[PDB]
Design a protein around this nucleic acid. Sequence first.
RNA 1: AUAACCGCUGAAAGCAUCUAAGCGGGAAGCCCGCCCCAAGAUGAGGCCUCCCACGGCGUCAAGCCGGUAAGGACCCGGGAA
RNA 2: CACCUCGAUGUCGGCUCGUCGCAUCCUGGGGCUGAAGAAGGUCCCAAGGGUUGGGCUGUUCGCCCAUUAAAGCGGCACGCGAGCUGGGUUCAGAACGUCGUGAGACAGUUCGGUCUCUAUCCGCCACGGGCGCAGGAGGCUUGAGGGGGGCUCUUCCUAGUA
Lengths: 138, 205, 174
Amino acid sequence: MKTYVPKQVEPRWVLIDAEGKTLGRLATKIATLLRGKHRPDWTPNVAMGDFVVVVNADKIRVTGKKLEQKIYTRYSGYPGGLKKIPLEKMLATHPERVLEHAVKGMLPKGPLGRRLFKRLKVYAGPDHPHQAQRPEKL
Amino acid sequence: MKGILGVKVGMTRIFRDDRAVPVTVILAGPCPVVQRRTPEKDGYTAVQLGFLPQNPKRVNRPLKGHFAKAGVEPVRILREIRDFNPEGDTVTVEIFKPGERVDVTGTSKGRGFAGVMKRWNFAGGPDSHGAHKIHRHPGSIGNRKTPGRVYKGKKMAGHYGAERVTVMNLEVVDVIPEENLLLVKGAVPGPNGGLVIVRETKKAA
Amino acid sequence: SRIGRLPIPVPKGVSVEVAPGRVKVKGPKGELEVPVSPEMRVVVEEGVVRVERPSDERRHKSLHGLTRTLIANAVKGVSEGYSKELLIKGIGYRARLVGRALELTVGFSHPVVVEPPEGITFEVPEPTRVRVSGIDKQKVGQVAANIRAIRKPSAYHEKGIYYAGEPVRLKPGK
RNA sequence: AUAACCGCUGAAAGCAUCUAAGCGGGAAGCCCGCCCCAAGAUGAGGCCUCCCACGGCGUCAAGCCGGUAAGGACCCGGGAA
RNA sequence: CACCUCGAUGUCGGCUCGUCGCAUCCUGGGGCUGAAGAAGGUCCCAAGGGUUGGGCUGUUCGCCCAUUAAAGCGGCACGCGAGCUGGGUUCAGAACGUCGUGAGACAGUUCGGUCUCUAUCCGCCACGGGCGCAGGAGGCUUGAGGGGGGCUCUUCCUAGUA
Ligand SMILES: [Mg+2]
Ligand SMILES: [Mg+2]
Ligand SMILES: [Mg+2]
Ligand SMILES: [Mg+2]
Ligand SMILES: [Mg+2]
Ligand SMILES: [Mg+2]
Ligand SMILES: [Mg+2]
Ligand SMILES: [Mg+2]
Ligand SMILES: [Mg+2]
Ligand SMILES: [Mg+2]
Ligand SMILES: [Mg+2]
Ligand SMILES: [Mg+2]
Ligand SMILES: [Mg+2]
Ligand SMILES: [Mg+2]
Ligand SMILES: [Mg+2]
Ligand SMILES: [Mg+2]
Ligand SMILES: [Mg+2]
Ligand SMILES: [Mg+2]
Ligand SMILES: [Mg+2]
Ligand SMILES: [Mg+2]
Ligand SMILES: [Mg+2]
Ligand SMILES: [Mg+2]
Ligand SMILES: [Mg+2]
Ligand SMILES: [Mg+2]
Ligand SMILES: [Mg+2]
Ligand SMILES: [Mg+2]
Ligand SMILES: [Mg+2]
Ligand SMILES: [Mg+2]
Ligand SMILES: [Mg+2]
Ligand SMILES: [Mg+2]
Ligand SMILES: [Mg+2]
Ligand SMILES: [Mg+2]
Ligand SMILES: [Mg+2]
Ligand SMILES: [Mg+2]
Ligand SMILES: [Mg+2]
Ligand SMILES: [Mg+2]
Ligand SMILES: [Mg+2]
Ligand SMILES: [Mg+2]
Ligand SMILES: [Mg+2]
Ligand SMILES: [Mg+2]
Ligand SMILES: [Mg+2]
Ligand SMILES: [Mg+2]
Ligand SMILES: [Mg+2]
Ligand SMILES: [Mg+2]
Ligand SMILES: [Mg+2]
Ligand SMILES: [Mg+2]
């Protein structure tokens, strides 16, 4: 008796509102979905996941003083090439990217983790591309 | 934000008001706009331009008689004036009046593989006393075990020249609609006969 | 003792509209919207409006005084809220008026020209005294402030821009 | 947009207080602005214009072979490259 | 102290090339002053850029000349010898003082004294070849993201006014 493993599956989509949801707390689940650790056939080496579409991402909200105090850093390659960007600045310039970031860091590392991140499509404000099913999830 | 293509012709001096005024005459010929860009179809705003009418047909198959003013299609079309939306077709040197300040993009003479010291105006080695084959050389490039490597911008010798260069705030000394000339003072990049694009200044705009 | 976060307000030209986070005053001289805490109910009663705090911790107490006084000001606001006087002292120094704008000479090599912001009105009864008229209290006090900061009172002489009242000073000097 | 700082309005604390809720000023510094690179930005973007949807086997998931088409190369005369 | 390195981690200083820190020398912004003005003092913010040329000594440093907005202090194997130097130190010659009967010896001095064409990898400057960018082409261009840059003085008017 070997353990069951999926054959090629159907890539289910999912829709999320994010307006008012917190951040990392929204991120946690978006990760789980991305992996598909909610599916009972879950396989570590394959990624049968859900595609995730998230909207109203300009509207994520967060607690404490993070809007000012929380900094994203970017080292270029160069002397003094470390860039420091506050939350407010990000949201104002590229809204989302903060959720994209929070989720990315929560996905695993390596070839496959990088693939799952492609399956998370994040937009600012309402709507999005209407192709797939995208059952709204709350 | 007015702009027009041209070719560096040569330099001379002008004697204006008992002063010398060295000048670089660039010829900016009539410039047959062959396309426009719109925040609708494009997402920004500019004009394609086109210059130097020649070829009978080397133009082959992809082309525009779409804007059709490309009649006598031009060798170099070099295009964006960025946010410029001119009067009708065909911008001329009428565009500029004398005493106007202008920025000029052009292609700097290629020096090919050029030492540090002429690339970077390094000091080089002494020509005597100890000497030993480092006269023209760069020196140390780094420290020791830390960082144990070379910084990512580190000035060294490589191809130098033959690049984009825009010398800014040049004064328009004269413009001669007759032959499509234009006279600015000084710095403008690159060889006689090379292409230059000529824009209004960014001191004010 | 007997802390001023819960006395009562006032009537008679004006309306009070409690919204969840804000209250709208709207009286004979104009209308003001007072942002208030989302928590902390403000109740309108007969000819008076009260404010009550949820808890007894210093967090709601501190918000309590503030909120009462914030509203009250908007009521004092929409009936005669302007004041803010400013007399100019010292020799070459005089104030003139230009249209709605205010031009003063405080001893720079230029005149200084101040346009009034929205809902603020300038008056110059004598060249040496000024008046800033307004509905909004904090905005009056600021505009007043801003004027006085061009040439603030000297320590060594009476020259400057003085809030009326605001006593004078001597170091002396040499 | 901020630093130190200067202020407004303002409680907790009847007074007072630039601060606890707010707001305004405020640096050669910060973010833009200028100049240059830049879609291997595998998140490979967009616009204009071209050529066209053959013939056989693979009766199918991609293809394959032969000419082709728009176009390129090659070779040659050269170049402030 | 004796922990990696004695089947080798080249040692002072210079030069070249920098990059970082800020406990800031200057420039910018500030509070206090026993701040009249000008000019200082002290303390706070600020690392963007700047931060001279000589005499002496191997010198670092220091002293001095002449200037300056200023003539900052540190780190990077007391940064940097497969980059250069080789004056110092630090082999073998020779001398002085001194010590030793002596051979010899001295963080004492003196003069002299071999510094190794070829870069595999990483890193760095440049420049191409390949494939990808799921129809192929010729033009044109958006800019995510990077990099460059960022100094300062005198005089004059205001006004010989405050
Ligand atoms: Mg050349
Ligand atoms: Mg050079
Ligand atoms: Mg030389
Ligand atoms: Mg030689
Ligand atoms: Mg070495
Ligand atoms: Mg390292
Ligand atoms: Mg502030
Ligand atoms: Mg007060
Ligand atoms: Mg009070
Ligand atoms: Mg506050
Ligand atoms: Mg501001
Ligand atoms: Mg500057
Ligand atoms: Mg470009
Ligand atoms: Mg591409
Ligand atoms: Mg493309
Ligand atoms: Mg040991
Ligand atoms: Mg032991
Ligand atoms: Mg050893
Ligand atoms: Mg070894
Ligand atoms: Mg060795
Ligand atoms: Mg400091
Ligand atoms: Mg100062
Ligand atoms: Mg003074
Ligand atoms: Mg001071
Ligand atoms: Mg600095
Ligand atoms: Mg001499
Ligand atoms: Mg000497
Ligand atoms: Mg010494
Ligand atoms: Mg010196
Ligand atoms: Mg240093
Ligand atoms: Mg040491
Ligand atoms: Mg060393
Ligand atoms: Mg050596
Ligand atoms: Mg080595
Ligand atoms: Mg020697
Ligand atoms: Mg020996
Ligand atoms: Mg003896
Ligand atoms: Mg000896
Ligand atoms: Mg010895
Ligand atoms: Mg000799
Ligand atoms: Mg020698
Ligand atoms: Mg290696
Ligand atoms: Mg390539
Ligand atoms: Mg950019
Ligand atoms: Mg930048
Ligand atoms: Mg004078």
